[PDB]
């Protein structure tokens, strides 16, 4: 009686050590485990009304007793516990803290869940059975409702907890008792006659109901009376209890008491908690299931008839975010907007008689203007859905679309990059990271662009009239004048961002015009409308081009918008726009040097690169359209060629080539030769042809000899730290000279562009053969040179090769080999290494494209030898494979050349290519992978690279063992020369550390074991079994091998 | 000097005790010892406007060991709900912890912390976390193994308690 109080004081005293608290807790737990714990708890709760902590502990004892030992107690003890709980509940007073009343309600509900109504499971239960089932619970609750004000709050807590557990929460006890609990809860609240309508239950149930009129007829009058008296706390309590008893009850109760009117009245009141709970309750009423649809119609009509009230509530909730966001109303604003955004589903069911729908859409639009993006983002999905569905489209067309369009246009900005934008104030509250805000802004702008795209698709004429007005006003504004005057904007300040937003709006309009072709019914009027749309687009394009905009990034966006245009226009109007695209994009910029790698020159280089992509894509899509315009495009390109570098010269030549091939122009062979031969002619140059076999000649052409001269002139010591030594003008000049020399010396990019686009869009087998006859005369002659070039780049990484190189540059070239603007000599060496890697990747891509030519490359007898001997690089004495070449280099080699070159085999040529290629390839791969694994942050990165290489090798094996694998298995398994290296490769793969590689290799072995076991047997017995000796299947394969090998010295060797 | 009673609640093994310890000392314990009862730890912070102290009542996260499973929340002035991102059962229990946490202390600020974010495999993806915005709780992604945001919850609680959003640790 006093030890418990002292222990509680120890537990709650801030001055007690954790050991003292733990000792006191041990004592209290001992008390809790006693047989008569509940009676002591009841005594403590009764006799200590002033001590809140001690009373709560007593109630906790009771709660543990009922909640953890209920099964143990007999009926007498259960009735005693119920009586004690009721006695404690009826004794509630004004001095009981809130958490005491919560605990008392918890006790009451815990007893009720386990004892209320269980007698009803029987038929005509006796008086004793009813009493054991708490037949009087409802009568007691009604009695508890009148004792005093404190008890009335307690009854509300009891109801809240009961209905929350029974219906909202997935409590287990009520899960078992559902069939008799849920009907009982509905019974007490619903009027008796209303209850009889839905349920057919007999009279015995009537004994469990005290108030014939139900409970709603008690709460709702109380709620209205509290609203009249403006009793905030009582209103909040009633809403808390009332918020949990709206989803489940019979709808007739909701309508009869007019709950929704009370909820709206609560909403009008300026009590934040009451408003929030009223919004939650209204949403529950809207989304809850309705058995009778007339009541649902009444509910939605009642909500929509009060759009003025909802607008007033929203206006009240609004606040100024400039100083500080009101955290007591911002959540309520989000709740309100979320509830509003769900109403639009009910629009078609409402007969507009007082402008309800117009007011609703105006309110939704007004909420969309909210400074917070999250608040706005709630309604964005509403606008997209409404525009797509023609059910609402007639209503939007009148009210909002004119204003929604203006909002969407004004809101298509880069919020994060603006200085002190009002939206960012809410960002730090709703998001805990900058990245979160950036991604949400990206999504928000995407959804906004959806709105503008759909508004222009539907109201195309209105949008176009609005668009021209917007563009004319903008480009006359001072910012527009700055944009049209400047040549390089800051890409972060207002002029550029505004212009970019304008061009995004234009892009959205063009996308809408494109969608209109699909959206508009294909009626008789379709052609006239489409011609008008095309004329409007032409006029807009002529308008935009006339501005003579020079800013590259803006000029790239304009070019891409016109690329969208061109999918529709045709004939001469197409050419007038395409020529202006070509000339404007490729216009020179005397104000800047196009080789300094400055941030303002990379913009121009990207601009010129964007056109190549767009022009090539457009040519691929619409070659027939460009057929008759080609005579003029050829002249335009010729006129523009002089002011283009090699890199873009190739792109525009590729555009012309695509038009020539895919458009069905006459004399294709002549034009093809005129375009291609001048570029590929560099391969056949006698100097390059002869010197490409000499490593030293390769070094000199790369310019390393000149670098040695430069280092000597600057007296750069062989060990001098190039990491810090600065680069000078002469260094940049030499680097530019070498790069310009290098690209034209080995036109790998030109070859890969011409071959790739040539074979891009084959339509018929005849066209494929025609192209083969077109590339064969000029690809086979150069294949030795291409493979030699790949050979040199491969041997360039071998340290011994540069041994004869001058010592001063020995460190420079070594830096170049190392993998992973330029201002230091170390960066110069890194850039040279980048040049080497770039040439190595493109020469691989040239080989893959030559593979695409099919029989031209595969059926050639020497191709396997050339390719492998050019990638192998076998040292004279040592068995090293391509010494000094990075593992990443091998990964790229395999992935980009060998896989395409293998999978790309023609099924009629596997009989001539694979036999002379698989043996050597397998030996090389085995030798390489064993060497890489023989050696086994920087080390972790190397491990990961080796894992990736092994994965690629396995993929090659998997892709070799469907239509293709069917023939490849036959080819491999019928030749020992190919099988034995393949078995070696499998044996090496299975044993490697990586788990996935071993697992997949074991699967492969299981797949083909039956076809191979037929000196293969000797190798299996001696190496495969020994090496093997994923786990279970590996053992399964081992046993499968054994069952035959040792069944047919093998067993003795295995035992050894 | 103010002193706010803070109750830290969450499923056992979620890192409540580790988080409290690492705020007491730099050490990041790795061995797991299930707290039994409650651990009271006076934790102090220095801010531009002065000093604040949180009596961090670290509650046991296991039913077998929670002595006064709810009595610890009595007179609490703020609370923190810790759930393990790597384990989705803990997040599933967050509504339960909030439910029986608001029963005792009603209007106190509550912070939901997703602990152990350092690992490469988090079963509770951020996309699946919506309880905090449902109950208007302030949510954070923290790890007492990386000190990713360890101090954020206390800063938010200090701002709410002192009614001084400009308050900042120094
Ligand atoms: N990866 C990772 N693991 C952590 C981190 N913090 C704690 N852990 C691990 O999680 C365990 C949590 O230990 P405790 O904090 O003592 O356990 P608790 O959270 O108090 O749970 P209870 O004691 O049962 O209430 C520790 O043993 C750590 O091994 C973290 O920041 N990152
Ligand atoms: Mg603990």
UniProtKB/Swiss-Prot annotation, chain A:
Gene Ontology biological process terms from the UniProt entry: protein export from nucleus; RNA export from nucleus; tRNA re-export from nucleus
InterPro entries: ARM-like (IPR011989), ARM-type_fold (IPR016024), Exportin-5_C (IPR045478), XPO1/5 (IPR045065)
Xref: Pfam families: Exportin-5
Any one of the GO CC terms: nucleus
Coiled-coil ranges per UniProt: none
Molecular-function GO terms, alphabetical: nuclear export signal receptor activity; RNA binding
Subunit structure: Interacts with CEX1.
Note: Present with 3500 molecules/cell in log phase SD medium.
Name of this chain's protein: Protein MSN5
The species this protein was found in: Saccharomyces cerevisiae (strain ATCC 204508 / S288c) (Baker's yeast)
Name of the gene this protein is made from: MSN5
Curated annotation (Swiss-Prot), chain B:
GO CC annotations, alphabetized: cytoplasm; cytosol; nucleus
Small GTPase Ran-type domain mapped to chain residues: 1-164
Stretches for region Switch-I: 30-38
GO molecular function: GTP binding; GTPase activity
Entry keyword Signal: no
UniProt-annotated binding residues for GTP: 11-18, 61, 115-118, 143-145
Subcellular location, record wording: Nucleus
GO biological process, one term: poly(A)+ mRNA export from nucleus
Keywords, comma-separated and alphabetical: Acetylation, GTP-binding, Nucleotide-binding, Nucleus, Phosphoprotein, Protein transport, Transport
Residue ranges, annotated region (Switch-II): 61-77
Membership in a protein family: Belongs to the small GTPase superfamily. Ran family.
The protein's role, per its UniProt record: GTP-binding protein involved in nucleocytoplasmic transport. Required for the import of protein into the nucleus and also for RNA export. Essential for cell viability. By analogy with Ras, Ran may be activated when GTP is exchanged for bound GDP by RCC1 and inactivated when GTP is hydrolyzed by Ran upon activation by RanGAP1.
Subunit and partners: Found in a nuclear export complex with RanGTP, exportin and pre-miRNA. Forms a complex with YRB1. Interacts with BUD5, CEX1, RRP12, SRM1, and DIS3/RRP44.
Listed name of the protein: GTP-binding nuclear protein GSP1/CNR1
Annotated organism of origin: Saccharomyces cerevisiae (strain ATCC 204508 / S288c) (Baker's yeast)
Included stretch of the parent chain: 10 to 179 of 219
